Amino acid sequence: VLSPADKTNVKAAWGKVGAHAGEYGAEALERMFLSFPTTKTYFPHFDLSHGSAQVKGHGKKVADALTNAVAHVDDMPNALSALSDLHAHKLRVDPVNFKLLSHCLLVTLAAHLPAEFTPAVHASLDKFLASVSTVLTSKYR
Amino acid sequence: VLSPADKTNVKAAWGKVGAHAGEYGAEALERMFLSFPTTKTYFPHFDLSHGSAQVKGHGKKVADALTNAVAHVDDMPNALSALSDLHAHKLRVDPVNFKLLSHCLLVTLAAHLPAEFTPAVHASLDKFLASVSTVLTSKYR
Amino acid sequence: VHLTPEEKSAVTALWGKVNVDEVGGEALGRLLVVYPWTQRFFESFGDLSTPDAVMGNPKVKAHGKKVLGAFSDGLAHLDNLKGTFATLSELHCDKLHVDPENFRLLGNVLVCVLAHHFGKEFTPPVQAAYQKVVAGVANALAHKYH
Amino acid sequence: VHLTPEEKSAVTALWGKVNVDEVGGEALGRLLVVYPWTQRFFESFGDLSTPDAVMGNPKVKAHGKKVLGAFSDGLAHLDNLKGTFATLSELHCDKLHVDPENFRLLGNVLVCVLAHHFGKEFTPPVQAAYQKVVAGVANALAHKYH
Numbered sequence: 001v002l003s004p005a006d007k008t009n010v011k012a013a014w015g016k017v018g019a020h021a022g023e024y025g026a027e028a029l030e031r032m033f034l035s036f037p038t039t040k041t042y043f044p045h046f047d048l049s050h051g052s053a054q055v056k057g058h059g060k061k062v063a064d065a066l067t068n069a070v071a072h073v074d075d076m077p078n079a080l081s082a083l084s085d086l087h088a089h090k091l092r093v094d095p096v097n098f099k100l101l102s103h104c105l106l107v108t109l110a111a112h113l114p115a116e117f118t119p120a121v122h123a124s125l126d127k128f129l130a131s132v133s134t135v136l137t138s139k140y141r
Numbered sequence: 142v143l144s145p146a147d148k149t150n151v152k153a154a155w156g157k158v159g160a161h162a163g164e165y166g167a168e169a170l171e172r173m174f175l176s177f178p179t180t181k182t183y184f185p186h187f188d189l190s191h192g193s194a195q196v197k198g199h200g201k202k203v204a205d206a207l208t209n210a211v212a213h214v215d216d217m218p219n220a221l222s223a224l225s226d227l228h229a230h231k232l233r234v235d236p237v238n239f240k241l242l243s244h245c246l247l248v249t250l251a252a253h254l255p256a257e258f259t260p261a262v263h264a265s266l267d268k269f270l271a272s273v274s275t276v277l278t279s280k281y282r
Numbered sequence: 283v284h285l286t287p288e289e290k291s292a293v294t295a296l297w298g299k300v301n302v303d304e305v306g307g308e309a310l311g312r313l314l315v316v317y318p319w320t321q322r323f324f325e326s327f328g329d330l331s332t333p334d335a336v337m338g339n340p341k342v343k344a345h346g347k348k349v350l351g352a353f354s355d356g357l358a359h360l361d362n363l364k365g366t367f368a369t370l371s372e373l374h375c376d377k378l379h380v381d382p383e384n385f386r387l388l389g390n391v392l393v394c395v396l397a398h399h400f401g402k403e404f405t406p407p408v409q410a411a412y413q414k415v416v417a418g419v420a421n422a423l424a425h426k427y428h
Numbered sequence: 429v430h431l432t433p434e435e436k437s438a439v440t441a442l443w444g445k446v447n448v449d450e451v452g453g454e455a456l457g458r459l460l461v462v463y464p465w466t467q468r469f470f471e472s473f474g475d476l477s478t479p480d481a482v483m484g485n486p487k488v489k490a491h492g493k494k495v496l497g498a499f500s501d502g503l504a505h506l507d508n509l510k511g512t513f514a515t516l517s518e519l520h521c522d523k524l525h526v527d528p529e530n531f532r533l534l535g536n537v538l539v540c541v542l543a544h545h546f547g548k549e550f551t552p553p554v555q556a557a558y559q560k561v562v563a564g565v566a567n568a569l570a571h572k573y574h
């Protein structure tokens with residue numbers, strides 16, 4: 001459960017990404033592929049090398065999903081329901097992998113927004129990404 | 142998320158425990174202490190040996206909490222809110238440990254209710270205990 | 283991994299009663315039903331659409347027999363699980379990229395199957411000894427990730 | 429664990445710039461704030477009531493300096509992390525009963541601190557090399573559980 005301060009913290013930190021949203025989503029994916037190579041096997045149709053147009057485009061999609069969750073933080077199961085169906089039913093993503101992308105999103109934010117990434121904001125962002133991950137892994141069947 | 146069939150399956154299986162509820166909760170705790178000795182450190186005030194009156198009494202409490210969750214399966218965050226506060230705020234239980242007790246509860250049910258513990262019911266019970274665990278680990282701060 | 287002689291006795295006495303043609307399919311089938319992302323790795327197995335379809339799928343039963351044979355091998359070599367599982371580690375880690383958490387999950391599904399099949403005989407101390415076994419197998423299988 | 433020479437160069441070039449009196453307290457303090465069940469192990473440290481209290485607690489800073497010194501040792505012995513961490517494994521597993529998942533969490537908090545402090549220099553390939561390092565340290569620290 002996210003507190004009022006956690007919601008403020010996440011909105012404020014994410015607010016500072018501005019036009020770089022897509023770029024940071026793409027960077028987090030690259031960080032995940034390089035650090036945790038088991039995750040690459042879900043993208044056989046993409047080239048995962050640096051500067052990939054496919055990773056750049058996917059990073060914009062991931063960022064848009066995260067902004068949806070920030071904007072609808074009190075109704076996240078509903079906001080992310082279609083995406084939760086996709087990741088569990090069609091893509092069969094192993095739940096462990098959400099922890100890995102979440103960590104890489106934290107690293108990316110820390111590398112670009114050092115004034116925002118205080119210990120309290122770090123904690124809020126971790127809880128937020130853990131909540132997104134809980135929703136995205138809620139539909140296995 | 143629990144489907145209608147998962148809710149039916151869990152109620153039906155749990156229904157067959159009857160007067161043995163407290164006994165099976167106590168057995169699951171003993172199974173956890175023996176199999177995963179790191180969990181013992183949360184109970185320095187109990188003797189954890191076989192036949193312990195303290196483990197017997199605690200097993201009744203754990204079973205009562207599980208019956209509350211079965212009875213209020215559509216409102217589990219609310220039903221278990223006080224218990225979630227206790228485990229996270231006061232007791233500081235490491236979230237990993239909920240997976241361990243959940244597994245030991247599955248083992249105990251399997252050892253006593255073989256006709257009930259079909260693959261479909263196993264899956265429903267695992268999802269149910271994972272949902273209980275999600276609630277009980279939702280209040281860290 | 284560490285089993286005492288009394289745990290080893292517990293473990294091998296029960297294992298001698300296991301039906302080795304059936305228990306591995308029961309555990310693999312339950313893995314695919316309970317943790318359904320694991321189906322991603324078994325697309326060629328055909329019908330996995332329902333629990334009955336999974337449990338009655340002859341490819342699940344046959345593959346589960348292989349899995350169980352590897353556990354039997356680990357039981358026979360508890361003091362060198364790493365060597366015993368080296369090629370399977372290369373396969374599951376380097377080639378298949380299975381997250382090693384799933385090795386822990388399959389071991390625990392096997393424990394549940396043994397509980398189901400042995401009932402009161404699957405006592406808490408017998409379970410504790412089997413948890414050491416399945417932890418040691420998972421850790422050995424994950425060696426190529428370490 | 430497996431680092432290439434180019435990863436080792438990446439890792440040790442950055443590490444030479446780390447402030448060793450501060451970064452371990454920053455990581456331990458962030459562990460206690462982000463994963464607050466870990467506070468169960470630090471009752472004698474006094475005021476942990478707020479993020480500012482944790483990060484400014486001199487016992488957190490001092491203890492974090494010890495933690496970081498162990499990471500430095502692992503960096504200096506990447507080919508024998510097990511020996512390097514043997515007594516710390518006995519302490520954290522046999523004596524303190526810390527769940528080994530928390531070793532992974534602390535390593536990843538350290539990665540976040542390095543990202544924060546090095547910014548664009550903490551490139552994706554530099555992170556990947558540090559993930560191998562913190563995975564190897566966690567696995568070595570958990571050896572008494574295996």
Ligand code: HEM
Nearest residue numbers: 039042043061062065066086087091093097098101102132
């Ligand atoms: C923060 C967590 C995550 C978010 C917000 C997220 C978001 C998204 C978005 C928005 C899409 C596009 C959906 C479409 O086009 O409707 C997608 C696709 C997908 N995601 Fe994720 N995702 C997450 C984690 C993961 C993880 C951990 C993996 C696997 C390691 C993964 C694998 C995929 C794949 C394989 C696709 C489809 C790619 C296409 O087939 O081309 N996702 N994700």
Ligand code: HEM
Nearest residue numbers: 180183184202203206207227228232234238239242243273
């Ligand atoms: C299915 C999961 C669990 C359920 C339903 C559950 C249930 C309960 C219940 C009902 C109480 C008594 C609450 C009171 O007296 O208000 C309790 C107490 C407590 N639980 Fe759990 N619990 C769960 C998992 C865990 C785990 C995994 C651990 C640690 C390994 C744990 C450690 C404790 C402790 C240490 C107490 C207090 C004991 C007293 O200080 O005497 N619980 N739990």
Ligand code: HEM
Nearest residue numbers: 320323324348349352353370380384385388389419420423
């Ligand atoms: C404790 C855990 C496990 C044991 C002991 C085990 C054992 C084995 C065995 C003995 C084989 C046959 C190898 C042969 O044909 O030489 C196999 C094949 C395979 N296993 Fe497992 N396995 C484990 C876990 C898993 C998991 C968790 C998955 C995926 C969710 C998986 C996926 C596969 C696949 C897809 C193959 C077929 C490989 C091929 O023929 O190319 N295994 N496993």
Ligand code: HEM
Nearest residue numbers: 466469470494495498499516526530531534535565566569
């Ligand atoms: C990668 C992970 C970690 C490293 C390298 C590490 C390193 C160390 C070091 C170097 C010491 C001092 C030992 C001395 O005084 O000789 C220590 C003490 C201790 N550590 Fe850690 N640690 C790790 C993770 C953790 C975690 C996750 C916890 C608990 C959440 C923890 C709890 C403790 C405690 C409570 C002590 C004090 C023991 C005592 O003085 O009796 N450690 N650790």
